[PDB]
Write a protein that holds these residues in place. Structure first.
Motif, mmCIF file in Angstrom:
data_model
loop_
_atom_site.group_PDB
_atom_site.id
_atom_site.type_symbol
_atom_site.label_atom_id
_atom_site.label_comp_id
_atom_site.label_asym_id
_atom_site.label_seq_id
_atom_site.Cartn_x
_atom_site.Cartn_y
_atom_site.Cartn_z
ATOM 1 N N UNK A 61 41.778 68.419 40.005
ATOM 2 C CA UNK A 61 42.177 67.006 40.040
ATOM 3 C C UNK A 61 41.355 66.138 39.100
ATOM 4 N N UNK A 62 41.597 64.852 39.125
ATOM 5 C CA UNK A 62 40.835 63.921 38.376
ATOM 6 C C UNK A 62 39.496 63.646 39.062
ATOM 7 N N UNK A 63 38.455 63.554 38.258
ATOM 8 C CA UNK A 63 37.098 63.316 38.742
ATOM 9 C C UNK A 63 36.582 61.903 38.394
ATOM 10 N N UNK A 64 36.280 61.160 39.442
ATOM 11 C CA UNK A 64 35.821 59.796 39.311
ATOM 12 C C UNK A 64 34.411 59.653 39.832
ATOM 13 N N UNK A 65 33.488 59.411 38.924
ATOM 14 C CA UNK A 65 32.123 59.164 39.335
ATOM 15 C C UNK A 65 31.957 57.675 39.654
ATOM 16 N N UNK A 66 31.283 57.381 40.756
ATOM 17 C CA UNK A 66 30.806 56.051 41.045
ATOM 18 C C UNK A 66 29.306 55.909 40.846
ATOM 19 N N UNK A 67 28.935 54.896 40.088
ATOM 20 C CA UNK A 67 27.521 54.587 39.799
ATOM 21 C C UNK A 67 27.313 53.077 39.930
ATOM 22 N N UNK A 68 26.145 52.584 39.515
ATOM 23 C CA UNK A 68 25.801 51.159 39.624
ATOM 24 C C UNK A 68 24.866 50.653 38.526
ATOM 25 N N UNK A 127 36.578 70.249 46.346
ATOM 26 C CA UNK A 127 37.365 69.028 46.445
ATOM 27 C C UNK A 127 38.396 68.872 45.299
ATOM 28 N N UNK A 128 37.999 69.281 44.109
ATOM 29 C CA UNK A 128 38.816 69.224 42.929
ATOM 30 C C UNK A 128 40.026 70.196 42.929
ATOM 31 N N UNK A 129 39.887 71.313 43.645
ATOM 32 C CA UNK A 129 41.020 72.200 43.905
ATOM 33 C C UNK A 129 41.942 71.703 45.008
ATOM 34 N N UNK A 130 41.384 71.047 46.018
ATOM 35 C CA UNK A 130 42.131 70.588 47.155
ATOM 36 C C UNK A 130 42.866 69.271 46.933
ATOM 37 N N UNK A 131 42.361 68.422 46.034
ATOM 38 C CA UNK A 131 42.840 67.053 45.872
ATOM 39 C C UNK A 131 43.223 66.791 44.424
ATOM 40 N N UNK A 132 44.111 65.826 44.184
ATOM 41 C CA UNK A 132 44.457 65.380 42.830
ATOM 42 C C UNK A 132 43.452 64.356 42.317
ATOM 43 N N UNK A 133 42.641 63.808 43.214
ATOM 44 C CA UNK A 133 41.644 62.816 42.847
ATOM 45 C C UNK A 133 40.395 62.989 43.674
ATOM 46 N N UNK A 134 39.254 63.051 42.994
ATOM 47 C CA UNK A 134 37.984 63.217 43.681
ATOM 48 C C UNK A 134 36.981 62.128 43.254
ATOM 49 N N UNK A 135 36.482 61.407 44.236
ATOM 50 C CA UNK A 135 35.496 60.361 44.044
ATOM 51 C C UNK A 135 34.130 60.881 44.528
ATOM 52 N N UNK A 136 33.145 60.774 43.670
ATOM 53 C CA UNK A 136 31.784 61.128 44.029
ATOM 54 C C UNK A 136 30.829 60.083 43.424
#
Lengths: 557, 555
Positions: free
Chosen positions: A55-62, A289-298
């Motif tokens: 799936x798509x991988x979305x990193x959250x940072x600050x 998570x990336x195999x199970x979902x189309x979108x993964x937020x970490x």
């Protein structure tokens, strides 16, 4: 309106995690329940889905953290929930907190307000026992080193060179510097050592970077514990400890399935430091998570200068990930602090200080771009912000080439994340990433340090103590010079001076000490004193914590 | 086949099925996988007035290098009663994780008499020992922080008796100096670690009636003294709430099963010298409501384990044991005869005759508590029919019921004979249980009475420091508590070389300590090892686990 955090979490209506798992296509035999609202999932899931697309991988940072706070994990959960409301097949991956802070100052939600992962109490305490496993694997190795000395020291370890400390998951400053092995010849070998907090364990970093249990075992065998009287490294493999360590970790290697308040599935797995380690959750969790979902937020620890850089340059490098987008969380109040406003005066509108402090955000935005990842700014709403402040901030973000969205997930849950989620989806659809790590591993240690310092921190350059120099030269000699570099620096400034807020210029970084984590597989240059074992405060939360006959718990939050 | 191999081949029931069949409701069960669960304290609350079933204690003769197979018999006796259609549960202690990496790693029981899953039991199990470790170490961290923050209570750091714990065998942690590095890093002091299962917190867990009682117990823990000699407690440091929170889940007993699917609880696992050596009151009292017959045990020989079980555990709980099984082997009684470990393969009727005097005292000892004794000779394929017979006879001449037990080899059928005498003893021999002493006696009176009545000593001697320690504890209002003798387990006497039934000797108390939270006084007759060490060639070195999850070197 908005109730307290632990009030929110109590009222949560959780789904049994077995339903969430079967919903994701995980089989009943791949699920080990710990009650009905937590489970460990087998690494067989990854294996059987190994050839499916990610799936798509979305990193959250600050932005650079400040006394005002920025709301990062809340944003992560909130984004996840928003994506779920928009019909997306999504998971969030997060770190397990250390138990210790609960009894010191914290604990607090995994998130905040209407953006949380639950069950909250369990997550903060023993959870599924992963940190106990880490603690015992780590301490077993120490026990074995000491026993080796006791039994005639066949490997000829110089005890005074032992770098492998012990751990415990409590804030206990009295264990920082100790002398053990006292009492005479039946009771060991006198030596100087100490404890670190368990989440600072190289074992924790190993868990978070391992691909599977056999990889974890290999990494364990490479851990350097000290040196011989002639200066040769001695490893865990030399002591034959890795099999036992692995065994102790045979359930800890599995990620823990839990959920958001809106029942979106979530993994919580691992939780390293973000200065002396890379500050991410496990590769095992994210890759599953990336195999199970189309979108993964970490997400990753600290600001984007530390957490995001290490997410990209360590975790993604090892795992073969290619992140698709990155969300940078910021607040008006935090940016005003970066523009010189003291904490006590943050409610007063000050457009000039906001404009000045935005330089912090701008540099993080630029930096994310250096890894070829498109960036979206999430502005955490706060009641005191004025419209004029918010509108200026939006205009500054657009001038900087970044989409921006106001996020009100704390107050409104997933509904508050819809604008952010849509901006993320528009980014994923129209600006594919071109991910690449910042630096090649075959550079020298100094070259790698300087790339990071100059490109990410904006430092002019890097100075070294004589001790740092000798350490680098030895590690290069021992063959550890082609590893990643994990900078241990204050999180409160791009520089190594915690008082330099905003976007400091004309500064140099000073590397004082360099350490080796041979199991996790990286070099750790250290710029100031790092607190690997924090202490308790004058008035610890432990004094105010109680639980009554009905099992109601007060003082915890 | 090996114990682990037997264990691998067990067809385990899902524990939920066992729970509902016991009449436990679903919402009172908290699964750890399919084959372990925690049981809520609401099962006892709601069955508060349903009647208690029968209570069977399993103890043993004086331990030896020969081994007596007590746990094996407890489990086997339980499977026997199950076979005879009875509603039965066995309750056992949780073993320390440490030994798995040092010498041991064993079955809970042996051969065809085990509780499973053996591997999880030996390691993290359901996490209760980690909860113990953390509750204990938090208090220590709080003591140390208190010193660092101005020492408001005026604690003399050099008097602190509260050590730290960890559940690994690590001799290098026995004696340490902490608090080094300066103003910023604590207050230098001498201390050390004990194995986690030795913790007072573990003893408290096993003696608490419920979580609020566990809390109150915590508050009474004594951690050290002020510079003026005044006791300072965990209550004084406001630690008990946090310690109780950490034990929120560990207070619940763990439902597992025997190989033949008889339900078992495993819960708690204290030392049997500096503590009482029983599984938790909570598990036994719950089982007692769920079953007609409860089988449980206590550590070491009848002189330590059983006595403490009667005088500590039943006292605090108000149990009245209905029968007690004394386990014995021929190999063991031979060694009490004087036969060195190496010649136990020979027969020897004269030495088995002389050794019997150990068993004979234990039997007499059970009878002083008003409990009907029943002997189980644990059958070892080395034993000659003439040997067994001599034993059979001797029990019968000493006046006690006795059965042969082949549960190691044959499982629950191995134990039917035994289980028929037990049932026959319950149906028609009602116990008249009573503790050995009243709490109102002086401390010296209570020790004397254990030492002369149970160990057969001529009397007791005290060092000056033990005198001093006693006088002070009495002065501080602790003289009304049960005594828990910390002594060698390998002799009724305090000298471990004296096997059999030694006469004409005295017990010397060298030191006396206090466990104010667990609720008892601990006289000590020689050095007690509270942190065992690893051996020259630890099991850890040969432990391995491969890509398929198969484990080697562990058992």
């Amino acid at each position: 309106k908005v109730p307290s955090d632990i009030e929110i979490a109590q009222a949560a209506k959780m789904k049994p995690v077995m339903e969430l798992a079967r919903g994701l296509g995980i089989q009943e035999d791949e699920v080990e329940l710990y009650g009905k609202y937590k489970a460990k999932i087998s690494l067989d899931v990854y294996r059987r889905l190994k050839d499916k697309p990610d799936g798509k991988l979305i990193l959250v940072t600050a932005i650079t953290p400040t006394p005002a706070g920025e709301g990062k994990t809340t944003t992560s959960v909130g984004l996840t929930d928003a994506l779920a409301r928009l019909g997306k097949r999504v998971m969030v991956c997060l770190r397990e907190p250390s138990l210790g802070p609960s009894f010191g100052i914290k604990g607090g939600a995994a998130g905040g307000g209407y953006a949380q992962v639950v069950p909250m109490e369990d997550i903060n305490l023993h959870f599924t026992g992963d940190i106990h496993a880490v603690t015992y694997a780590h301490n077993l190795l120490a026990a074995m080193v000491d026993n080796h000395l006791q039994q005639g020291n066949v490997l000829n370890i110089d005890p005074r060179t032992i770098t492998w400390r012990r751990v415990i998951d409590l804030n206990d400053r009295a264990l920082r510097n100790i002398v053990i092995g006292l009492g005479g010849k039946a009771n060991g070998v006198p030596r100087e050592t100490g404890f670190d907090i368990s989440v600072a364990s190289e074992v924790m970093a190993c868990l978070c970077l391992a691909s599977d249990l056999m990889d974890l075992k290999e990494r364990f065998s490479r851990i350097v514990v000290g040196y011989t009287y002639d200066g040769k490294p001695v490893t865990a493999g030399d002591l034959e400890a890795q099999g036992s360590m692995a065994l102790l970790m045979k359930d800890a290697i599995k990620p823990n399935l839990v959920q958001t308040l809106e029942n979106t599935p979530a993994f919580i797995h691992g939780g390293p430091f973000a200065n002396i380690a890379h500050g991410c959750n496990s590769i095992i969790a994210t890759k599953t998570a990336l195999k199970l979902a189309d979108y993964v937020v970490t997400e990753a620890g600290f600001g984007a200068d530390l957490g995001a850089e290490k997410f990209y340059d360590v975790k993604c490098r090892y795992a073969g990930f290619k992140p698709d987008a990155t969300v940078i969380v910021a607040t008006v109040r935090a940016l005003k602090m970066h523009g010189g406003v003291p904490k006590s005066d943050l409610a007063t509108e000050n457009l000039e200080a906001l404009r000045e402090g935005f330089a912090n955000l701008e540099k993080h935005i630029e930096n994310i771009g250096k890894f070829g990842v498109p960036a979206v700014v999430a502005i955490n709403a706060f009641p005191t912000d004025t419209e004029a402040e918010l509108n200026l901030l939006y205009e500054l973000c657009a001038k900087a080439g970044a989409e921006v969205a106001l996020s009100e997930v704390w107050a409104k849950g997933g509904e508050g994340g819809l604008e952010l989620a849509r901006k993320v989806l528009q980014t994923l659809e129209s600006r594919p990433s071109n991910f690449h790590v910042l630096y090649n591993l075959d550079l020298s240690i100094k070259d790698k340090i300087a790339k990071i310092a100059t490109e990410i921190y904006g430092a002019d350059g890097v100075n070294y103590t004589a001790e740092a120099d000798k350490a680098i030269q030895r590690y290069e000699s021992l063959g550890y010079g082609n590893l990643p570099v994990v900078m241990a620096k204050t999180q409160y400034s791009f520089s190594d001076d915690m008082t330099k807020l905003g976007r400091p210029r004309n500064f140099t970084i000073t590397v004082r000490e360099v350490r080796l984590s041979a199991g996790a597989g990286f070099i750790v240059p250290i710029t100031g004193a790092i607190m690997t074992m924090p202490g308790l405060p004058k008035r610890p939360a432990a004094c105010n914590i109680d639980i009554d006959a009905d099992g109601v718990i007060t003082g915890l939050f």
